[PDB]
């Protein structure tokens, strides 16, 4: 008959089926399945991945890719590439919205369920990026 | 004459005669140079119109990145590029 | 994700009176010297 | 192995690269990595 394929997981997680209270620092850099209640849901915000620009003097389209520590599982060297407003020859660039790519980003807060929480203590919560 | 050059002629136009003993090889000075930041990737151009100095860099690459002071980007993506971050 | 704002100028008023030590007036006088100098009957610097 | 500190980093990342002081390589490839050059 281009976007890379993602993976999702179901099944028994064993000791990795945890709670926002039960999550400690021994579970860092591990795949965890956390059950809870959603308390806060941030606004779905687009995040720029590749920006496309136009040079009218030479009439050419450029692009720049952007990455952060969230989109990758393996940490790489952080190279902050600034937003290009000028090409290598010195000509002004116009941002081509509609050709740039934006990926929806959300933050949610997962708290322990009031059914499984201790009845008098303050609840524990975690942040999840989507 | 070359023997009557004094401190009153410093930074002055002088006409003086003599003989030529040696001519050096042609060194390459930079008139227009494009610089790029190492990690910031900020592109800048330095134009030089004064090459007639000796023993000293009267024009040098900037000590720090110029992306912060210019504020060209509205988003403006503490991040410092480091000392002398530009390559030619 | 907006562009860099640009700055431009346009001459409107006369402004302050020009001074001889100003760089612009020195450049203009030099330009007139190049364009208007005659040795015998020819603009030698213009032709050069 | 010490975690008793509050309001302060008693152990932090090195201020400069440790490749020059160690002299681990005989080839030893002025080059400076910059202030605080380490990433966790
Ligand atoms: Zn930079």
From Swiss-Prot, chain A:
Compartment(s) of residence: Nucleus
Function: Acts as a component of the MCM2-7 complex (MCM complex) which is the putative replicative helicase essential for 'once per cell cycle' DNA replication initiation and elongation in eukaryotic cells. The active ATPase sites in the MCM2-7 ring are formed through the interaction surfaces of two neighboring subunits such that a critical structure of a conserved arginine finger motif is provided in trans relative to the ATP-binding site of the Walker A box of the adjacent subunit. The six ATPase active sites, however, are likely to contribute differentially to the complex helicase activity.
Further remarks about this protein from its record: Present with 35100 molecules/cell in log phase SD medium.
Similarity comment: Belongs to the MCM family.
Assembly and binders: Component of the MCM2-7 complex. The complex forms a toroidal hexameric ring with the proposed subunit order MCM2-MCM6-MCM4-MCM7-MCM3-MCM5; loaded onto DNA, forms a head-head double hexamer. Interacts with CSM1.
Protein name: DNA replication licensing factor MCM3
Species for this entry: Saccharomyces cerevisiae (strain ATCC 204508 / S288c)
Organism taxonomic ancestry: Eukaryota, Fungi, Dikarya, Ascomycota, Saccharomycotina
Curated annotation (Swiss-Prot), chain C:
Localization of this protein: Nucleus
Region (Disordered): 1-21
Domain of life assignment: Eukaryota
Further comment found in the protein's record: Present with 10300 molecules/cell in log phase SD medium. Early fractionation of eukaryotic MCM proteins yielded a variety of dimeric, trimeric and tetrameric complexes with unclear biological significance. The MCM2-7 hexamer is the proposed physiological active complex.
Family: Belongs to the MCM family.
Quaternary state and interactors: Component of the MCM2-7 complex. The complex forms a toroidal hexameric ring with the proposed subunit order MCM2-MCM6-MCM4-MCM7-MCM3-MCM5; loaded onto DNA, forms a head-head double hexamer. Interacts with CSM1.
Role noted for this protein: Acts as a component of the MCM2-7 complex (MCM complex) which is the putative replicative helicase essential for 'once per cell cycle' DNA replication initiation and elongation in eukaryotic cells. The active ATPase sites in the MCM2-7 ring are formed through the interaction surfaces of two neighboring subunits such that a critical structure of a conserved arginine finger motif is provided in trans relative to the ATP-binding site of the Walker A box of the adjacent subunit.
Protein name, per record: Minichromosome maintenance protein 5
Protein encoded by which gene: MCM5
